[PDB]
Amino acid sequence: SLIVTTILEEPYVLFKKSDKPLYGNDRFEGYCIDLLRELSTILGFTYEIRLVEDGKYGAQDNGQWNGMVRELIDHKADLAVAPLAITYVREKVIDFSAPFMTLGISILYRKGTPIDSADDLAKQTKIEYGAVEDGATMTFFKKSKISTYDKMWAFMSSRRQSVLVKSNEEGIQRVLTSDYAFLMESTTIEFVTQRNCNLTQIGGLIDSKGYGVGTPMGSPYRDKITIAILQLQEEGKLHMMKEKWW
Amino acid sequence: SLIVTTILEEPYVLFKKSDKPLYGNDRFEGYCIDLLRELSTILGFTYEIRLVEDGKYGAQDDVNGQWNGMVRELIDHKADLAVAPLAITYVREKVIDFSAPFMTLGISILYRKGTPIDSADDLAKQTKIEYGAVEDGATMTFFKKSKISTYDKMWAFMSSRRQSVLVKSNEEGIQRVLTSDYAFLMESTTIEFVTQRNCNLTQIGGLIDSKGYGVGTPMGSPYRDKITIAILQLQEEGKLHMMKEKWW
Ligand SMILES: C=C(C)[C@H]1CN[C@H](C(=O)O)[C@H]1CC(=O)O
Ligand SMILES: C=C(C)[C@H]1CN[C@H](C(=O)O)[C@H]1CC(=O)O
């Protein structure tokens, strides 16, 4: 039996709503749960789903790793199945399957302003902007030497206290209730904009990355999961699953 | 010193044009060459570029189970890396390893502008307009393996007309499109290069699937995750994007 570490994030993983109380794996549904189930069928493993205790994805603080990334490092889990960005920093410490979805950083804002691009935000200060603290998105800006993104980070880091948030939900509410643009992942933006008609992605994608299944470094499951993902992708299951949940 | 297998394909890999004949790695330029050089700098390896002898990418001979092309080179440890527009596929992954993708693309349709043909389904449900792909390439293999109804049907068509509608290069496919009533199934990245250069050609519909190109290594090779890590760095600092801009 595999321990599968995950995190609450709609529509990837959520508590299934029902009257009768649900137990163990039944409690969960979502794109990632469907994925996990499809993988389980192809590969022939059983599993226990567990929500990462510290509720973090995985960042380096003292140099300590946290979240689902730490769980894999310490062998406290076999797989991480969540919207976990495949990144340089994470890849040095864990392994990732080939990506099951592709995405990019982009901007969440209200409809019908003059704001048209990242550069439009960067060259002003009236409209505040930020991102989830210590997430892949934030780290991209923190490390970027592209001139526009450098400026944005200078803005964000200096207003760290007030513009950086602890979740996508927190960021979304900010956008809805104040003059604020949220830097978030395009896949999540798409879900949100379908459900709030007054909101909209601004500009295009700022970068490119994927979500992958995480495994402890050197794990034999890696390429097995990779092969499974490619199979699923080519036969259009991954696509149906996106269509289902979006 | 690493042995790097590759193949001539614009704008990924090409012979540098010059009066004086050039030697070794100097002979080559392109997106993939730039990539290889950037990887070499990050990882600190030296290398020798070699064009794959049989001039194939990699399919399994379905009579005798022999692999060919760059995939075969890696399997046999005749090379350390394959750097080319080598699609990361289910069948190939079972026999070699791939880095994380340096480019994302998908199968699409190259056709002439301003017909009623709008999708793969439109092609599949007729026979007047012929269609095909590079023989034994990733695109053909996708249709050959697909259980999607429309694609299954397309493969029935193609395989039975194997004689005449499957081609040996992108270039051959393109000439076909230009000079007869034919739609060419090819990779979207290549479509884009081509359409920028022939003003009467266009992409029909959207992407039929999604895949990446990755650097190939022999299974269990340690180079894998090193190269992957290098690719993620290059992707995150926007160098991969600049490189595409440069060559397109
Ligand atoms: C905090 C969110 C939910 C996570 C999700 N994926 C990204 C990650 O892998 O860290 C983060 C998005 C972001 O940083 O904007
Ligand atoms: C025969 C072309 C040039 C190659 C290139 N990449 C794909 C591959 O990795 O096989 C093939 C495209 C295709 O099959 O349409």
Q: Do A95 and B142 touch (CB under 8 A)?
A: no
| DSSP-derived pairing of the beta strands A214-216 and A209-211 | unpaired
How far is residue B244 from each of residues A236, B37, B162, B241, measured CA to CA in Å? 27, 15, 34, 5
Q: Is A59 labelled a binding residue?
A: no
Q: Which residue has the tokens 């700098």?
A: B41
Angstrom distance (rounded) from CA A198 to CA A177: 12
What is the chain B residue with the closest CA to A105? B236
**Does 3.40.50.2020 match the CATH number of domain A104-208?**
no
Angstrom distance (rounded) from CA A105 to CA B92: 31
Q: Do A1-103+209-246 and A104-208 agree at the fold level?
A: yes
Judged by DSSP in three states, A176 sits in: helix
CATH top-level class of B1-105+211-248: alpha beta
User: Residue A163: CA atoms inside 13 Å, Cβ hemisphere, count?
Assistant: 23
Residue nearest ligand 1's atom 3 by CA: A168
Q: What is the DSSP string of chain B?
A: -EEEEE--BTTTBEEPP-SSPP-GGGGEESHHHHHHHHHHHHHT--EEEEE-TT-----B-TTT--B-HHHHHHHTTS-SEE-SS-B--HHHHTTEEEPSPSEEE-EEEEEESS-S--SHHHHHT-SSSEEE-BTTSHHHHHHHH--SHHHHHHHHHHHHTHHHH-BSSHHHHHHHHHHSSEEEEEEHHHHHHHHTT-TTEEEESS-SS-EEE--EEETT-THHHHHHHHHHHHHHTTHHHHHHHHH-
Burial of A110 per CB tally in 10 Å (0-12, 13-18, 19+):
middle
A with B: how many residue pairs have Cβ under 8 Å apart? 72
Q: Is A77 labelled a binding residue?
A: no
How far is residue A29 from each of residues A7, A24, A32, B72, measured CA to CA in Å? 12, 12, 8, 42
Angstrom distance (rounded) from CA B12 to CA B14: 7
The DSSP bridge partners found for residue A51 are A6
Token duo for residue B19: 């009066």
Min Cα–Cα distance to chain B from A84, Å: 14
| Residue among B140, B73, B110, B83 at smallest CA distance from B204 | B110
What is the rounded (10 degree) CA torsion for A164, A139, B245, A236?
-90
Task: Give the nearest ligand 2 atom to B86 CA.
Answer: 9
Angstrom distance (rounded) from CA A69 to CA B83: 30
What is the chain A residue with the closest CA to B103? A208
Angstrom distance (rounded) from CA B96 to CA A243: 31
Min Cα–Cα distance to chain B from A236, Å: 8
Minimal Cβ distance to B142: which of A92, A140, A234: A234
Angstrom distance (rounded) from CA B135 to CA B204: 21
How far is residue A121 from each of residues A137, A186, A198, B133, measured CA to CA in Å? 16, 17, 19, 45
| Residue among A120, A124, A101, A118 at smallest CA distance from A191 | A101
How far is residue A224 from each of residues A40, A48, A215, measured CA to CA in Å? 11, 19, 11
Task: Give the nearest ligand 1 atom to A84 CA.
Answer: 9
B237 vs A contacts (CB less than 8 Å): 143-145
**Residue numbers after which chain A breaks, C to N beyond 2.5 angstroms:** 61
Which of A164, A168, A207 best tests ligand 1's pocket when mutated (most atoms within 8 Å of CB)? Answer: A168
Token duo for residue A66: 């946290």
What is the B143 CA–ligand 2 centroid distance (Å)?
Answer: 13
Angstrom distance (rounded) from CA A170 to CA A174: 6
Angstrom distance (rounded) from CA B8 to CA A11: 44
Min Cα–Cα distance to chain B from A146, Å: 8
Token duo for residue B238: 């926007």
Angstrom distance (rounded) from CA B39 to CA B237: 13
Min Cα–Cα distance to chain A from B148, Å: 7
How far is residue B15 from each of residues B8, B11, B51, B73, measured CA to CA in Å? 8, 10, 11, 21
Angstrom distance (rounded) from CA A1 to CA A6: 16
The CATH T-level fold of domain A1-103+209-246 is: D-Maltodextrin-Binding Protein; domain 2 (3.40.190)
Q: Do B229 and A86 touch (CB under 8 A)?
A: no
Question: Residue ranges of the domains in chain B?
Answer: 1-105+211-248, 106-210
The CATH T-level fold of domain B106-210 is: D-Maltodextrin-Binding Protein; domain 2 (3.40.190)
How far is residue B27 from each of residues B21, B36, B49, B179, measured CA to CA in Å? 8, 14, 9, 33
Minimal Cβ distance to A236: which of B148, B211, B236: B148
Angstrom distance (rounded) from CA B44 to CA A92: 17
Q: What H or E segment, with its residue span, contains residue A172?
A: helix A168-177
Q: What amino acid occupies position B168?
A: K
**Which residues of B sit in the known binding site for L-glutamate?**
85, 87, 92, 138-139, 187
Q: Which residue has the tokens 């978030």?
A: A184
A86 vs B contacts (CB less than 8 Å): 100, 232
What is the chain B residue with the closest CA to A229? B90
Minimal Cβ distance to B232: which of A88, A144, A227: A88
Resolution (A): 3.4
Minimal Cβ distance to B232: which of A91, A227, A231: A91
A88 vs B contacts (CB less than 8 Å): 229, 232-233, 236
| DSSP-derived pairing of the beta strands B2-6 and B81-82 | parallel
Does the Cβ of B87 fall within 6 Å of ligand 2? yes
| DSSP-derived pairing of the beta strands A199-202 and A105-110 | antiparallel
